[PDB]
PDB file of C-alpha atoms in Angstrom:
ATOM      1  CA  UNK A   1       0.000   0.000   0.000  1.00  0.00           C
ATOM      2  CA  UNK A   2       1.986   3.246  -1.230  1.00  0.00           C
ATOM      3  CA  UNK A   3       0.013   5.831   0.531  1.00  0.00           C
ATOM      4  CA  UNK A   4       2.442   7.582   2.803  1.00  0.00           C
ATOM      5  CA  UNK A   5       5.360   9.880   3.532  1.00  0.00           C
ATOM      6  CA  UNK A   6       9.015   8.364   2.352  1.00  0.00           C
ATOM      7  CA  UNK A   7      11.900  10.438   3.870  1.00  0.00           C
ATOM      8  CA  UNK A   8      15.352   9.213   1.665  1.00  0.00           C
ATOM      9  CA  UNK A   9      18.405   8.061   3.493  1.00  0.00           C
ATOM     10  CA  UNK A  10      20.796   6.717   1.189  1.00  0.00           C
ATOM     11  CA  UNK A  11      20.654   7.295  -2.751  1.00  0.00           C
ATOM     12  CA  UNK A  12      23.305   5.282  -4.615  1.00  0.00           C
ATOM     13  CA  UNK A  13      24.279   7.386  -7.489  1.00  0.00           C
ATOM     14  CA  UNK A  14      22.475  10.737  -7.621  1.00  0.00           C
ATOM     15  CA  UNK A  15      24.925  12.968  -9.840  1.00  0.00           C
ATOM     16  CA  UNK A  16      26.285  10.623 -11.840  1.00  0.00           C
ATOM     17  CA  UNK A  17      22.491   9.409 -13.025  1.00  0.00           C
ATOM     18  CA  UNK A  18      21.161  13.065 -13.400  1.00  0.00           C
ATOM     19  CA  UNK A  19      24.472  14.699 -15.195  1.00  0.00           C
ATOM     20  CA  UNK A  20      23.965  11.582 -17.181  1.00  0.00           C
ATOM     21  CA  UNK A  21      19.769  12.057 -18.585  1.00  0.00           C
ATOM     22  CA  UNK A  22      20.751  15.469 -19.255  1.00  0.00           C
ATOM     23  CA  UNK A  23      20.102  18.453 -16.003  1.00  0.00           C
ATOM     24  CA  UNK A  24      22.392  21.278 -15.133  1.00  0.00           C
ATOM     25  CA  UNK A  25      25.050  21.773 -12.305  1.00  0.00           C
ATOM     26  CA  UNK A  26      21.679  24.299 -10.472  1.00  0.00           C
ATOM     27  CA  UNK A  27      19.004  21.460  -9.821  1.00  0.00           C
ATOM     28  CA  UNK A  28      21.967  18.408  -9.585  1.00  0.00           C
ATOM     29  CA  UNK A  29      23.305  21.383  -6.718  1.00  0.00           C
ATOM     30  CA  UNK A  30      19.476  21.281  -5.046  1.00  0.00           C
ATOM     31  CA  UNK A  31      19.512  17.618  -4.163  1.00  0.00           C
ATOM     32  CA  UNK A  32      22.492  16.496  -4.049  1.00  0.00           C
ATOM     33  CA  UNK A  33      22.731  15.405  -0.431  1.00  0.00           C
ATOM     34  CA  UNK A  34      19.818  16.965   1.287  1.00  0.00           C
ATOM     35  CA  UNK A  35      17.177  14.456   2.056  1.00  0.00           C
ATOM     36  CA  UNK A  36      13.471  14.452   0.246  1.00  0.00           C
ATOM     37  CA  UNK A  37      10.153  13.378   1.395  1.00  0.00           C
ATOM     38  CA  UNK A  38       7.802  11.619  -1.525  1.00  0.00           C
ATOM     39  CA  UNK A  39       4.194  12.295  -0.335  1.00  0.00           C
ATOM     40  CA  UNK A  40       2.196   9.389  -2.470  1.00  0.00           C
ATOM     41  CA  UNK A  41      -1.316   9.210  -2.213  1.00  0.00           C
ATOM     42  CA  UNK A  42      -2.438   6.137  -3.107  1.00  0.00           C
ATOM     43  CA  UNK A  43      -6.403   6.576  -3.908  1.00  0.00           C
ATOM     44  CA  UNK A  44      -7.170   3.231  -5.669  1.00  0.00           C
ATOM     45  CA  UNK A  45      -6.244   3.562  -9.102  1.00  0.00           C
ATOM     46  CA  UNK A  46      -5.511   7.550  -8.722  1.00  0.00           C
ATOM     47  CA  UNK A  47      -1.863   7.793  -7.776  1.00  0.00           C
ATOM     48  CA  UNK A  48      -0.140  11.122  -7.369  1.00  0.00           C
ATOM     49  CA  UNK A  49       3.858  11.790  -5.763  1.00  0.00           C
ATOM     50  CA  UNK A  50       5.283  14.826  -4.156  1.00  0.00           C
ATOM     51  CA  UNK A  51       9.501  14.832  -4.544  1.00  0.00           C
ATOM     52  CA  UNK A  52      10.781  18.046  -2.321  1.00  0.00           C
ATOM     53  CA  UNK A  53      14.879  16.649  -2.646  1.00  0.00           C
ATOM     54  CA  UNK A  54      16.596  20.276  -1.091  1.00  0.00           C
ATOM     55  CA  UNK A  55      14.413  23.050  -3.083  1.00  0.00           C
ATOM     56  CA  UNK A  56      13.104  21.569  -5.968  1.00  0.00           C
ATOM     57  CA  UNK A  57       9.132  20.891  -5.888  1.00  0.00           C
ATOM     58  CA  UNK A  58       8.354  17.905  -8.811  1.00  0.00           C
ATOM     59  CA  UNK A  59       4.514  16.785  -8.344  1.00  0.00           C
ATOM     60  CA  UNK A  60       3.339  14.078 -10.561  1.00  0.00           C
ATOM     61  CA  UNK A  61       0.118  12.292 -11.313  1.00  0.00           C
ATOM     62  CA  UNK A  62      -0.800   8.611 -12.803  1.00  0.00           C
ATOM     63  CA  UNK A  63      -3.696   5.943 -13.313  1.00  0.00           C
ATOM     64  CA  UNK A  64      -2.515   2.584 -13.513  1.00  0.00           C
ATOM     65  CA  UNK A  65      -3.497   0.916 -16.846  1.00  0.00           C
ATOM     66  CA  UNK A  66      -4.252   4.502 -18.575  1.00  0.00           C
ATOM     67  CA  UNK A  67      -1.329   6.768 -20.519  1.00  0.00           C
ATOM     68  CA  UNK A  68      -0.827  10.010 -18.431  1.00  0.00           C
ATOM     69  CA  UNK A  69       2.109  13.108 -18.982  1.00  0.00           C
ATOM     70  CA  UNK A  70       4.780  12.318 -15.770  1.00  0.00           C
ATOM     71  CA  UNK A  71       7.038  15.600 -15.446  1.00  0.00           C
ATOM     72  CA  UNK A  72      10.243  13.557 -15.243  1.00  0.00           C
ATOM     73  CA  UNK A  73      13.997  15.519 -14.347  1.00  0.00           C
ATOM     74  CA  UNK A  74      14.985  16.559 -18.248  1.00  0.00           C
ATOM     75  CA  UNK A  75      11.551  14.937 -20.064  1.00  0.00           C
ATOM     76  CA  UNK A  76       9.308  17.557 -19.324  1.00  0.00           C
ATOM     77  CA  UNK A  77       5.574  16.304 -19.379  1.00  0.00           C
ATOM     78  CA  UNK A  78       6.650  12.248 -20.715  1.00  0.00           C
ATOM     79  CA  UNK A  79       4.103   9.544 -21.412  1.00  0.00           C
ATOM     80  CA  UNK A  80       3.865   5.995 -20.108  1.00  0.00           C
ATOM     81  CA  UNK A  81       1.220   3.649 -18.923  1.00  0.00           C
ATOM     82  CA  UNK A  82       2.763   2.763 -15.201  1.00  0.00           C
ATOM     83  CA  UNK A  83       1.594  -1.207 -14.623  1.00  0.00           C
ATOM     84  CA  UNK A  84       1.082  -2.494 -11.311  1.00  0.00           C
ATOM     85  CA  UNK A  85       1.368  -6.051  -9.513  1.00  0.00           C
ATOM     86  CA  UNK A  86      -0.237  -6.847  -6.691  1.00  0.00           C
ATOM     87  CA  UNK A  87      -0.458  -3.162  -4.287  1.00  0.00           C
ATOM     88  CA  UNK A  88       3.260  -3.194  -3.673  1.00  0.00           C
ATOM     89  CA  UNK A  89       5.555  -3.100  -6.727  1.00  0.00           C
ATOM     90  CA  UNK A  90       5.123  -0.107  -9.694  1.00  0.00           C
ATOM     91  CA  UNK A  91       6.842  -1.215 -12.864  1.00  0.00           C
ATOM     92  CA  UNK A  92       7.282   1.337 -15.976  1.00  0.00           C
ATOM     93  CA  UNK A  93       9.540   2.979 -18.482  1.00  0.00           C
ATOM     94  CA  UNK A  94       9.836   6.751 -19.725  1.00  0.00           C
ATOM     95  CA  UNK A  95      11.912   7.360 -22.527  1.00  0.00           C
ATOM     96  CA  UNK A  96      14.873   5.074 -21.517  1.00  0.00           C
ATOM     97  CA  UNK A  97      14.487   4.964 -17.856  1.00  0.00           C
ATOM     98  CA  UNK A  98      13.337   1.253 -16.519  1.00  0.00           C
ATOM     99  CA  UNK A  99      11.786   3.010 -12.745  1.00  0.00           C
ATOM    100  CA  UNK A 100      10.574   0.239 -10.956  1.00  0.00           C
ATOM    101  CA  UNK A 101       9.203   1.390  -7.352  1.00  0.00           C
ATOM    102  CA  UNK A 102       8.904  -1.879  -4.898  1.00  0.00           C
ATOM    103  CA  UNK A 103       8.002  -1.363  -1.779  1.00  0.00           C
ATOM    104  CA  UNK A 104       9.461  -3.627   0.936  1.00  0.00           C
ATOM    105  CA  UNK A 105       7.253  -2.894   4.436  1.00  0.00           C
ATOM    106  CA  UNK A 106       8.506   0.750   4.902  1.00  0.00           C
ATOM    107  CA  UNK A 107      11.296   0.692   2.321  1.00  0.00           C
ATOM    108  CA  UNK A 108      10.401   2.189  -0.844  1.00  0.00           C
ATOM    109  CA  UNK A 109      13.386   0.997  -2.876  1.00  0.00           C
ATOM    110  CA  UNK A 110      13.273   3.138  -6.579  1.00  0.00           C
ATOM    111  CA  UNK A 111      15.929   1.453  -8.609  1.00  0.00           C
ATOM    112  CA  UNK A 112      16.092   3.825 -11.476  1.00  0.00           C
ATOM    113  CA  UNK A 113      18.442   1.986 -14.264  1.00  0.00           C
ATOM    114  CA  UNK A 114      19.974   4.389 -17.632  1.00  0.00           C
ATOM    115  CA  UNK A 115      21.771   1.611 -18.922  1.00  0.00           C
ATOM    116  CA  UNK A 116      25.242   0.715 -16.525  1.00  0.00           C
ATOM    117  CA  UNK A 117      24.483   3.676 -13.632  1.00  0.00           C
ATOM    118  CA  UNK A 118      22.032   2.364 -11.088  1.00  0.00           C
ATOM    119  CA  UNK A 119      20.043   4.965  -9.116  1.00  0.00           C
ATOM    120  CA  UNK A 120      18.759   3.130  -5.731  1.00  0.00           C
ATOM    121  CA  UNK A 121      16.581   5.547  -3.245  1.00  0.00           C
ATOM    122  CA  UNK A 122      16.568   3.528   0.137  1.00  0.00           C
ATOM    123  CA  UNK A 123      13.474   5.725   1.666  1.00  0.00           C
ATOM    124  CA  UNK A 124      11.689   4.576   5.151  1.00  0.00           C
ATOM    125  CA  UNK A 125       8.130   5.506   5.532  1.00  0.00           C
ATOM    126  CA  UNK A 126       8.165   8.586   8.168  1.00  0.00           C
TER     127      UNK A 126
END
């Protein structure tokens, strides 16, 4: 069940991923160790998620099973149909950007793969 507040601990590989998609050194310089909470409300099928990493305010909004516009980091308003199994794992790509969101309890582990550079969020549910 995703609906709750994720506060990030540890993120393998945050500005070697984002130089990487394509962002400047001024939103890389944000988030680049200061901690962000994802607010997710989980209302059924009506999904939105609240990133706040440093000063840097990304709110998104999906249906699983329908094609909706995420604003991704450099992809400005992207779209993918997210697909989910079970209540507890969200698997989906962007452009080239396999995000697959499993929750484990309170760990919402995002392991965010380019192609080689893996981008794992440890985040406990606050």
């Amino acid at each position: 069940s995703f609906s709750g507040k994720y506060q990030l601990q540890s993120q393998e590989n945050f500005e070697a991923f984002m130089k990487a998609i394509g962002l400047p050194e001024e939103l890389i310089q944000k988030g680049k160790d200061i901690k962000g909470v994802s607010e997710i409300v989980q209302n059924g099928k009506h999904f939105k998620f609240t990133i706040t990493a440093g000063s840097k305010v990304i709110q998104n909004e999906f249906t699983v099973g329908e094609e909706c516009e995420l604003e991704t980091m450099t992809g400005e308003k992207v779209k993918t149909v997210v697909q989910l199994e079970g209540d507890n794992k969200l698997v989906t790509t962007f452009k080239n950007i396999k995000s697959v969101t499993e929750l484990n309890g309170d760990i919402i582990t995002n392991t965010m793969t380019l192609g080689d550079i893996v981008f794992k969020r440890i985040s406990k549910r606050i």
